[PDB]
Each structure stands twice: as C-alpha cells, then as structure tokens.
Amino acid sequence: NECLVETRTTRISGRDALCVDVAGALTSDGSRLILYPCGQQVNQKWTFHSDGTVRSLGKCLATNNSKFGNLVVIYDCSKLAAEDISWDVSVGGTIMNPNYEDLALTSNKATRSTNLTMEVNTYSASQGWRVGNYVQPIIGSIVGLDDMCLEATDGNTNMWLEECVPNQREQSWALYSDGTIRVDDNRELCVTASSSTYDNWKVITILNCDGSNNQRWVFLADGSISTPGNQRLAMDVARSDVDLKKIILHRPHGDLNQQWVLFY
Amino acid sequence: NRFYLLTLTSNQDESITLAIDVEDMVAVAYQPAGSHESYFFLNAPQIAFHTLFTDTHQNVLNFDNTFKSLENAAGTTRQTIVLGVDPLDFAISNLFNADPKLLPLSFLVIIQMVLEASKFRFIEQSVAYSFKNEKTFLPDLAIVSLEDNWSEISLQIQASTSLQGLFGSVVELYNSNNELIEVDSIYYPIILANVALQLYHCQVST
Amino acid sequence: ANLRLSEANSGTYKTFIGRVREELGSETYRLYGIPVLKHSL
Ligand SMILES: OC[C@H]1O[C@@H](O[C@H]2[C@H](O)[C@@H](O)[C@H](O)O[C@@H]2CO)[C@H](O)[C@@H](O)[C@H]1O
Ligand SMILES: OC[C@H]1O[C@@H](O[C@H]2[C@H](O)[C@@H](O)[C@H](O)O[C@@H]2CO)[C@H](O)[C@@H](O)[C@H]1O
C-alpha cells in the first residue's frame, strides 16, 4: 500500500524466451549484452530506478555509437554522460532510450549468446521484450467471437476459430516474451500476418518463426489482439463469420469480432 | 449519486434490484420487486441506508459483504460453491424470497457471477461458458486468486506508473491447471487483458 | 441494467457485463487503457 516504487529488481526476457544477460558476468565498464537462457544469476538480474536507469552489477545499461559502436553494454553511471543510460519500457514490449528517438533494443538472431543491439524501430518480434521475473511463455487458449477458440489447423498451416474442446492440443497457444503466439505442440511454428489478403487487409496465419514485424502481437486493455506502435491494427474474424474461417488484421473499430480473451 | 442499481430477474419472472457501491465495487443492499422489505449488509455504508430503498423497511443482515463473512455465514468456501445459469436462477429466487438459511450462499453466486465477472474477463468467460455449454463450474485457485487479489492488483497497476510498469510487490496468481504465476509487472496478459475495471487507490497518470 | 435469465445466453450475458463495465468504468481516467471506477454517477 504505497504508490511510489523507488527501486526494483526483475529480469528481462525476449525472443524465443531468452534472457537479457551481461556477457560472462564480466563487470568492467564496457562489458557486452547477450541473450542467454534464463537463470538465477546476478548478471541476468536487472534493477530499475526512479531516475530512469536500469542496472546490473552496480552499473547501468548503456548505448552509444561514439564509445561502444552499435552494441549495448553496462557501464559505470558516475563516469559516463547522462543521456546514454536513460531507458523507457512501453506497453507493447518496446525497450528504448528516449534520447535516441528512432531506435529500439534488438536481438538480431534468436540463438544463445547473440550480442544485443540498438536498431531502428520497426516494431519487430525481435525488438519486443517482456519485463518481469516470470520468463516462461504464458500457455492457454485464445477465445474470440461467440466463445470459439482459435485453432491451429490444416497440419498447422492455417488458423481459424473453432468450437471449444477441453485440452485440444492445437487449440492451446503459448504467448512468448517476444510478442509471438506460438503453437503449444510445436514452438518453431508461430502466428503471423501473411502477405495474402482479403478485402484489402492482411490474412493472419501460421508460419515458421523468423522474428519479423508480421509476428509481434500485444494483448491490449480493450481486449484486442493488436500490433504494437502508434499506428495500430488488430486481429479480426472477417465479418464475424466463422464459416469463412479467416482472421484479417484490420483498422481497430473495436467491435465483438475484434474482442478476444486469453483463457489460461 | 454514489450507488448503482441493476436488476436480476428469474425463470419465474421474479425480479430483485441489487445496489452496488461504485466506490468499492461491492453489493450493499437489495430489494425484491413489489416488496416493502429491503435488505442491507451489516457493513453497508451509512449513505446507502440514507439514500437507497427509502420507501421500505430496511433490514440489517447478519453478515458483511466481505468474502470471509459470506463464507463463514454460508458454511462453505467459494472453492465449493458451483456457479452457472441454474445456480444463479436459484440464487435470485432465494434473494426474492428472503430465505435466511440460503442468503450468504445466494450472494456468493450473485457476486461472483456479476461483480467478479465485471472485474476480470477470465471470470466473465468462465461464466459465459456455463451459459454456452449448459453446464456449471465451481471455481479453482485461478478465479479465487483473482477475486482475492483485485484490490492489490489495482494498487500495483497504479503504483507501477512510478517505475516503468513494475509492481511494488509480487502478486501471486494461478492458472487453470493450478500452477503458480508470480506476477510482478504490468507486462503480462494475465493482468492487462484480464482486468476490466480497477479499484482507485492513488491519483496517478499513465 | 436488467439481466433476465428466462431468455439469456452468452450473448446477452456478455452485453450485460458490458453495460455494468460501461456505467461503472471511467471514460476519462484509465491507466494502460484499464479504466478506474467512476468517482460519481
Ligand atoms: O559468456 C556468456 C555467459 O557466461 C556464463 O557464465 C560463464 C562465465 O562467463 C565463464 O567465465 C565461466 O567459465 O563459465 C560460466 C558458465 O558456467 C553465464 O552463466 C551466462 O548467463 C552468459 O552470461
Ligand atoms: O467481413 C470483414 C469485415 O466486416 C466489416 O463489417 C461489415 C459486416 O461484416 C457486413 O455484414 C456489412 O454488410 O458490412 C460491414 C462493413 O460496412 C468490418 O467493418 C471490418 O472490420 C471487417 O471485420
């Protein structure tokens, strides 16, 4: 029962459920950032502060081309300038330094020991992160219009609403720290906004996960399954007809066809 | 106006009107339709007695609108009482007839299926499934943890706005296979999708 | 805000919960798009 929160220590996870990890626990000013599988190590633990810094091992997360190049790195707070260690977390997964307004934290490939980087903001599956000490993907059903669950169908190639079944493996999904909705049985398959369209809107279907901005999704307070960014579009059964068997990403009018529920 | 009335009618067209304190999102009182009696929880706020159901004999019930008191008064836990279309129907009748031996349990059905359903989309959908599939459910830890944690969640949502969406304190919730999720930040669909209305704690901006 | 059970389904039940939330939840004040309960009515 206090509303001010001064200091906090959590951990940061991302693409394919990998954690933001300071390289080899090394403490020196200028030590590298990597993705590493999650665990109980002090280098993976991150502490947020009221000033705006995020620290590990006594030193703040930093970004600057003039000093370290493209890379992201921990550095001592008192010696370094003021602007290269301010950070900001946004509701749809974007970690970014406000002082570098066009840019965003990124893992360029998904596989262990990747160096993290600041890249231009495209709101991509890679540029998306979940801040929070619970790093595991949130497994459950997705329920849409008329209490139909989203089903991974046709050998897991195409996705549409079908009528609920208890514990159907294909009807459950797994929402990952990166933004992606993965299939429960298979994790290499994932949800995607495909290039093939209907009535000048993109059809959503499953594909192999690459980490592109066709694949990053956010569950909004209004109950939409939506894309990140100022421009917004949401998941949508087309014209509320389950028979068509197609979900279209559309302008968010926010009617029942764009209402969804994570039934965990 | 501090209170909000809504009407629940039964399978025999028996209507009650229930009164919600908008401030805390709890039921304070109700009146059966065409009845000179109205019934108030023991901890209902004074203003409620002075404003609601003035044209009636206002009776003070033998429990408060807290879960603990409704559970001790009904002799069971939320973990035991089944919810669904039919048990709701029955609860409405019981409140209409003012049956003292059922009341606390009749409230546990109504409150859960209307007020807790308004607070959380997970609970809303759990209840909608009873209507859809014609079959009832008695809540596990997953619904009980949300019910029990609503005020703390609300406080922690409001608190997070002073530190990048992180909570002041971990909030333990459970999934539908009774597994523990220690939530500690706004950045979970468990919170952000789920919570539909939040209890005021502090004056903060996003 | 009347929910009548004799002719109720998930549709009208959801519309009812919808009405509760619309009249209880603030239009102006929301945080992360989640409305705080109204001060008055
Ligand atoms: O190198 C990345 C990696 O380091 C792991 O810790 C290493 C440590 O760097 C090395 O000096 C030692 O010999 O082995 C350790 C692993 O057993 C971290 O555990 C991991 O998170 C990454 O940060
Ligand atoms: O079909 C996808 C599409 O529906 C639009 O609404 C349609 C509605 O489905 C149809 O019955 C009516 O005749 O025309 C409407 C458009 O004027 C939604 O607006 C759009 O978001 C999609 O969901």
Coordinates of N, CA and C in Angstrom, one line a residue, chain A residues 10-161:
Chain A
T10 N 14.1 -7.0 -11.3 CA 13.4 -8.0 -12.0 C 14.4 -8.6 -13.1
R11 N 13.9 -9.4 -14.0 CA 14.7 -9.8 -15.2 C 14.0 -9.6 -16.5
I12 N 14.7 -9.5 -17.5 CA 14.2 -9.1 -18.8 C 14.4 -10.3 -19.8
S13 N 13.3 -10.6 -20.4 CA 13.3 -11.8 -21.3 C 12.8 -11.3 -22.7
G14 N 13.1 -12.1 -23.7 CA 12.7 -11.7 -25.1 C 12.5 -12.9 -26.0
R15 N 12.9 -12.7 -27.2 CA 12.8 -13.7 -28.3 C 13.1 -15.1 -28.0
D16 N 12.3 -16.0 -28.4 CA 12.4 -17.4 -28.0 C 12.6 -17.7 -26.5
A17 N 12.1 -16.8 -25.7 CA 12.2 -17.0 -24.2 C 13.7 -16.9 -23.7
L18 N 14.5 -16.1 -24.3 CA 15.9 -15.9 -23.8 C 16.0 -14.7 -23.0
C19 N 16.8 -14.7 -22.0 CA 17.0 -13.5 -21.1 C 18.1 -12.6 -21.5
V20 N 17.9 -11.3 -21.3 CA 19.0 -10.3 -21.4 C 20.0 -10.6 -20.3
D21 N 21.3 -10.8 -20.7 CA 22.3 -11.4 -19.9 C 23.6 -10.6 -20.2
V22 N 24.2 -10.0 -19.2 CA 25.5 -9.4 -19.3 C 26.6 -10.5 -19.6
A23 N 27.3 -10.3 -20.6 CA 28.3 -11.3 -21.1 C 29.2 -11.8 -20.0
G24 N 29.2 -13.2 -19.8 CA 30.1 -13.8 -18.9 C 30.3 -13.3 -17.5
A25 N 29.3 -12.6 -16.9 CA 29.3 -12.0 -15.6 C 30.4 -10.9 -15.5
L26 N 31.0 -10.4 -16.6 CA 32.2 -9.6 -16.5 C 31.7 -8.2 -16.1
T27 N 32.4 -7.5 -15.2 CA 31.9 -6.3 -14.6 C 32.5 -5.0 -15.2
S28 N 33.6 -5.0 -15.9 CA 34.3 -3.9 -16.3 C 33.4 -3.0 -17.2
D29 N 33.6 -1.7 -17.1 CA 32.9 -0.6 -17.8 C 33.1 -0.9 -19.3
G30 N 32.0 -1.2 -20.0 CA 32.1 -1.6 -21.4 C 31.9 -3.1 -21.6
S31 N 31.3 -3.9 -20.7 CA 31.0 -5.3 -20.9 C 29.7 -5.5 -21.7
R32 N 29.7 -6.4 -22.7 CA 28.7 -6.8 -23.6 C 27.4 -7.5 -23.1
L33 N 26.3 -7.1 -23.8 CA 25.0 -7.6 -23.6 C 24.7 -8.7 -24.7
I34 N 24.1 -9.8 -24.2 CA 23.8 -11.0 -25.0 C 22.4 -11.6 -24.6
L35 N 21.8 -12.4 -25.4 CA 20.7 -13.3 -25.0 C 21.3 -14.5 -24.4
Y36 N 20.9 -15.0 -23.2 CA 21.3 -16.3 -22.7 C 20.1 -17.0 -22.0
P37 N 20.0 -18.3 -22.1 CA 18.9 -19.0 -21.4 C 18.8 -18.6 -20.0
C38 N 17.6 -18.4 -19.5 CA 17.2 -17.8 -18.2 C 17.8 -18.5 -17.0
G39 N 18.1 -17.8 -16.0 CA 18.6 -18.5 -14.8 C 18.8 -17.5 -13.7
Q40 N 19.2 -18.0 -12.5 CA 19.2 -17.3 -11.2 C 20.5 -16.5 -11.0
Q41 N 21.1 -15.9 -12.0 CA 22.4 -15.3 -11.9 C 22.3 -13.8 -11.9
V42 N 23.3 -13.2 -11.2 CA 23.2 -11.7 -10.8 C 23.4 -10.8 -12.1
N43 N 24.1 -11.4 -13.0 CA 24.3 -10.7 -14.4 C 23.0 -10.7 -15.2
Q44 N 22.1 -11.7 -15.0 CA 20.8 -11.6 -15.7 C 19.8 -10.8 -14.9
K45 N 20.0 -10.5 -13.6 CA 19.1 -9.7 -12.9 C 19.3 -8.2 -13.1
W46 N 18.2 -7.5 -13.3 CA 18.2 -6.1 -13.6 C 17.4 -5.2 -12.7
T47 N 18.0 -4.1 -12.3 CA 17.4 -3.2 -11.3 C 17.0 -1.9 -11.9
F48 N 15.7 -1.6 -11.9 CA 15.2 -0.3 -12.4 C 15.1 0.7 -11.3
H49 N 15.3 2.0 -11.6 CA 15.4 3.1 -10.7 C 14.6 4.3 -11.1
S50 N 14.3 5.1 -10.2 CA 13.4 6.3 -10.3 C 14.0 7.3 -11.3
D51 N 15.3 7.5 -11.4 CA 15.9 8.3 -12.3 C 15.8 8.0 -13.8
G52 N 15.6 6.6 -14.0 CA 15.4 6.1 -15.3 C 16.4 5.1 -15.8
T53 N 17.4 4.8 -15.0 CA 18.5 3.8 -15.3 C 18.0 2.4 -15.0
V54 N 18.6 1.5 -15.6 CA 18.5 0.0 -15.4 C 19.8 -0.6 -15.1
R55 N 20.1 -1.2 -14.0 CA 21.4 -1.6 -13.7 C 21.5 -3.2 -13.4
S56 N 22.7 -3.6 -13.7 CA 23.2 -4.9 -13.2 C 24.6 -4.7 -12.6
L57 N 24.9 -5.5 -11.6 CA 26.3 -5.5 -11.1 C 26.9 -4.1 -10.7
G58 N 25.9 -3.2 -10.3 CA 26.3 -1.9 -9.8 C 26.4 -0.8 -10.9
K59 N 26.2 -1.2 -12.1 CA 26.5 -0.3 -13.3 C 25.3 -0.4 -14.2
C60 N 25.0 0.7 -14.9 CA 23.8 0.9 -15.7 C 24.0 0.5 -17.1
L61 N 23.0 -0.1 -17.7 CA 22.8 -0.4 -19.1 C 23.0 0.9 -20.0
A62 N 23.8 0.7 -21.0 CA 24.2 1.9 -21.8 C 24.3 1.6 -23.3
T63 N 24.1 2.7 -24.1 CA 24.1 2.6 -25.6 C 24.7 3.9 -26.2
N64 N 25.7 3.8 -27.0 CA 26.3 4.9 -27.6 C 27.2 4.4 -28.7
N65 N 26.9 4.9 -30.0 CA 27.8 4.6 -31.1 C 29.3 5.1 -30.9
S66 N 29.4 6.4 -30.5 CA 30.7 7.1 -30.3 C 31.7 6.4 -29.4
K67 N 31.2 5.7 -28.4 CA 32.0 4.9 -27.5 C 32.1 3.4 -27.8
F68 N 30.9 2.8 -27.9 CA 30.9 1.3 -28.0 C 30.5 0.7 -29.3
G69 N 30.2 1.6 -30.3 CA 29.6 1.2 -31.5 C 28.1 0.9 -31.4
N70 N 27.7 0.0 -32.3 CA 26.2 -0.4 -32.4 C 25.8 -1.1 -31.0
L71 N 26.7 -1.8 -30.4 CA 26.4 -2.6 -29.3 C 25.9 -1.9 -28.0
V72 N 25.2 -2.8 -27.2 CA 24.7 -2.4 -25.9 C 25.5 -3.1 -24.8
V73 N 25.6 -2.4 -23.7 CA 26.7 -2.6 -22.7 C 26.4 -1.9 -21.4
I74 N 26.9 -2.6 -20.3 CA 26.9 -2.0 -19.0 C 28.1 -1.1 -18.8
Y75 N 27.9 0.0 -18.1 CA 29.0 1.0 -17.8 C 28.7 1.7 -16.5
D76 N 29.7 2.2 -15.8 CA 29.6 3.0 -14.6 C 28.8 4.2 -14.8
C77 N 27.9 4.5 -13.9 CA 26.9 5.6 -14.1 C 27.5 7.0 -13.8
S78 N 28.4 7.1 -12.9 CA 29.0 8.4 -12.5 C 30.0 9.0 -13.5
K79 N 30.8 8.1 -14.1 CA 31.8 8.5 -15.2 C 31.1 8.8 -16.5
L80 N 30.3 8.0 -17.0 CA 29.5 8.2 -18.2 C 28.6 9.4 -18.2
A81 N 28.3 9.9 -19.4 CA 27.3 11.0 -19.6 C 26.0 10.7 -19.0
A82 N 25.0 11.6 -19.1 CA 23.7 11.5 -18.5 C 22.7 10.8 -19.4
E83 N 22.8 10.9 -20.7 CA 21.8 10.6 -21.7 C 21.8 9.2 -22.2
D84 N 23.0 8.5 -22.1 CA 23.1 7.2 -22.7 C 22.7 5.9 -21.9
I85 N 22.0 6.2 -20.8 CA 21.6 5.2 -19.8 C 20.1 5.4 -19.3
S86 N 19.5 6.5 -19.8 CA 18.0 6.6 -19.6 C 17.3 5.5 -20.4
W87 N 16.3 4.9 -19.9 CA 15.5 3.9 -20.6 C 14.0 4.1 -20.4
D88 N 13.3 3.4 -21.3 CA 11.8 3.5 -21.2 C 11.1 2.2 -21.8
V89 N 10.3 1.6 -20.9 CA 9.5 0.5 -21.3 C 8.1 0.9 -21.7
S90 N 7.6 0.4 -22.8 CA 6.3 0.8 -23.4 C 5.4 -0.5 -23.4
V91 N 4.1 -0.2 -23.4 CA 3.1 -1.2 -23.0 C 3.2 -2.4 -23.9
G92 N 3.4 -2.2 -25.2 CA 3.6 -3.2 -26.3 C 5.0 -3.7 -26.5
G93 N 5.8 -3.8 -25.5 CA 7.1 -4.5 -25.5 C 8.4 -3.8 -25.9
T94 N 8.2 -2.5 -26.2 CA 9.4 -1.7 -26.8 C 10.2 -1.2 -25.6
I95 N 11.5 -1.6 -25.6 CA 12.5 -1.0 -24.7 C 13.4 -0.1 -25.6
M96 N 13.5 1.2 -25.1 CA 14.2 2.2 -25.9 C 14.7 3.3 -25.1
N97 N 15.8 4.0 -25.6 CA 16.3 5.1 -24.9 C 15.6 6.3 -25.6
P98 N 14.9 7.1 -24.8 CA 14.2 8.3 -25.3 C 15.1 9.3 -26.1
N99 N 16.4 9.4 -25.7 CA 17.4 10.3 -26.3 C 17.8 9.8 -27.7
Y100 N 17.7 8.5 -28.0 CA 17.8 8.0 -29.4 C 16.5 7.7 -30.0
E101 N 15.7 8.7 -30.3 CA 14.3 8.6 -30.6 C 13.8 7.6 -31.7
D102 N 14.7 7.3 -32.7 CA 14.3 6.4 -33.7 C 14.6 4.9 -33.4
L103 N 15.2 4.6 -32.3 CA 15.8 3.3 -32.1 C 15.2 2.5 -30.9
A104 N 15.6 1.3 -30.8 CA 15.0 0.2 -30.1 C 15.9 -1.0 -29.8
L105 N 15.9 -1.5 -28.6 CA 16.6 -2.7 -28.3 C 16.2 -3.9 -29.1
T106 N 17.2 -4.7 -29.5 CA 17.0 -5.7 -30.5 C 18.0 -6.9 -30.3
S107 N 17.4 -8.1 -30.5 CA 18.3 -9.3 -30.8 C 18.2 -9.7 -32.2
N108 N 19.3 -9.6 -33.0 CA 19.3 -9.7 -34.4 C 19.0 -11.2 -35.0
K109 N 19.5 -12.1 -34.2 CA 19.2 -13.6 -34.4 C 18.7 -14.1 -33.1
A110 N 17.8 -15.1 -33.1 CA 17.4 -15.9 -32.0 C 18.3 -17.1 -31.8
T111 N 19.3 -17.0 -31.0 CA 20.1 -18.2 -30.5 C 21.1 -17.7 -29.5
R112 N 21.5 -18.6 -28.6 CA 22.2 -18.2 -27.4 C 23.5 -17.4 -27.7
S113 N 23.8 -16.5 -26.9 CA 25.0 -15.6 -26.9 C 25.0 -14.6 -28.0
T114 N 23.9 -14.3 -28.7 CA 23.7 -13.2 -29.6 C 24.0 -11.8 -28.9
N115 N 24.8 -11.0 -29.5 CA 25.0 -9.6 -28.9 C 23.8 -8.8 -29.2
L116 N 23.3 -8.1 -28.2 CA 22.1 -7.3 -28.4 C 22.6 -5.9 -28.9
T117 N 21.7 -5.3 -29.5 CA 22.0 -4.0 -30.3 C 20.8 -3.1 -30.3
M118 N 21.1 -1.8 -30.5 CA 20.0 -0.8 -30.7 C 19.8 -0.6 -32.2
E119 N 18.6 -0.9 -32.8 CA 18.3 -0.8 -34.2 C 17.0 0.0 -34.4
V120 N 16.9 0.4 -35.6 CA 15.8 1.4 -36.0 C 14.5 0.7 -35.7
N121 N 13.5 1.5 -35.1 CA 12.3 0.8 -34.7 C 11.3 0.6 -35.8
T122 N 11.2 -0.8 -36.1 CA 10.2 -1.3 -37.0 C 9.1 -2.1 -36.3
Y123 N 9.1 -2.1 -34.9 CA 8.2 -2.8 -34.1 C 8.2 -4.3 -34.4
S124 N 9.3 -4.9 -34.4 CA 9.5 -6.3 -34.8 C 9.6 -7.2 -33.7
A125 N 9.3 -8.5 -33.9 CA 9.2 -9.6 -33.0 C 10.5 -9.7 -32.1
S126 N 11.6 -9.4 -32.8 CA 12.9 -9.3 -32.2 C 13.0 -8.0 -31.3
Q127 N 12.5 -6.9 -31.7 CA 12.6 -5.7 -30.9 C 11.7 -5.6 -29.7
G128 N 11.0 -6.8 -29.5 CA 10.0 -6.9 -28.4 C 10.4 -7.7 -27.2
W129 N 10.1 -7.2 -26.0 CA 10.6 -7.8 -24.8 C 9.5 -7.8 -23.7
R130 N 9.6 -8.7 -22.8 CA 8.8 -8.8 -21.6 C 9.6 -8.5 -20.4
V131 N 9.2 -7.5 -19.6 CA 10.0 -7.2 -18.4 C 9.2 -7.8 -17.3
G132 N 9.9 -8.7 -16.6 CA 9.2 -9.4 -15.5 C 9.9 -10.7 -15.2
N133 N 9.9 -11.0 -13.9 CA 10.7 -12.1 -13.4 C 10.2 -13.5 -13.8
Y134 N 8.9 -13.6 -14.2 CA 8.3 -14.8 -14.8 C 8.6 -14.8 -16.3
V135 N 9.5 -15.6 -16.7 CA 10.1 -15.6 -18.1 C 9.5 -16.7 -19.0
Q136 N 8.7 -17.6 -18.5 CA 8.1 -18.7 -19.2 C 6.9 -18.2 -20.1
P137 N 6.7 -18.8 -21.2 CA 5.6 -18.4 -22.1 C 4.2 -18.7 -21.5
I138 N 3.3 -17.8 -21.6 CA 2.0 -17.9 -20.9 C 1.1 -18.8 -21.8
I139 N 0.9 -20.1 -21.3 CA 0.2 -21.0 -22.1 C -1.3 -20.9 -21.8
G140 N -2.1 -21.0 -22.8 CA -3.6 -21.1 -22.7 C -4.3 -20.9 -24.0
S141 N -5.6 -21.1 -24.0 CA -6.4 -20.8 -25.2 C -6.7 -19.4 -25.4
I142 N -7.1 -19.1 -26.6 CA -7.5 -17.8 -27.0 C -8.9 -17.9 -27.5
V143 N -9.8 -17.2 -26.8 CA -11.3 -17.2 -27.1 C -11.7 -16.0 -27.8
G144 N -12.4 -16.1 -28.9 CA -12.8 -14.9 -29.7 C -14.3 -14.9 -29.8
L145 N -14.8 -14.3 -30.9 CA -16.3 -14.2 -31.0 C -17.1 -15.5 -30.9
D146 N -18.2 -15.4 -30.2 CA -19.1 -16.4 -29.9 C -18.5 -17.6 -29.2
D147 N -17.6 -17.3 -28.3 CA -16.9 -18.3 -27.4 C -16.3 -19.4 -28.2
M148 N -15.8 -19.1 -29.4 CA -15.0 -20.0 -30.2 C -13.5 -19.8 -29.9
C149 N -12.8 -20.9 -29.8 CA -11.3 -20.8 -29.5 C -10.5 -20.8 -30.9
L150 N -9.5 -20.0 -30.9 CA -8.5 -20.1 -32.1 C -7.9 -21.4 -32.2
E151 N -8.0 -22.0 -33.4 CA -7.4 -23.3 -33.6 C -6.3 -23.3 -34.7
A152 N -5.2 -24.0 -34.4 CA -4.1 -24.1 -35.4 C -4.5 -25.3 -36.2
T153 N -4.8 -25.1 -37.5 CA -5.5 -26.1 -38.4 C -4.6 -26.5 -39.6
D154 N -5.1 -27.5 -40.3 CA -4.6 -28.0 -41.6 C -3.1 -28.3 -41.5
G155 N -2.7 -29.3 -40.6 CA -1.4 -29.7 -40.3 C -0.6 -28.6 -39.7
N156 N -1.2 -27.7 -39.0 CA -0.6 -26.4 -38.6 C 0.0 -25.6 -39.7
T157 N -0.9 -25.1 -40.6 CA -0.6 -24.2 -41.7 C -1.5 -23.0 -41.7
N158 N -2.8 -23.2 -41.3 CA -3.8 -22.1 -41.4 C -4.6 -22.0 -40.1
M159 N -4.9 -20.8 -39.6 CA -5.6 -20.7 -38.3 C -6.9 -20.1 -38.3
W160 N -8.0 -20.7 -37.7 CA -9.3 -20.0 -37.6 C -10.0 -20.5 -36.3
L161 N -11.1 -19.8 -36.0 CA -11.9 -20.1 -34.9 C -12.7 -21.4 -35.0

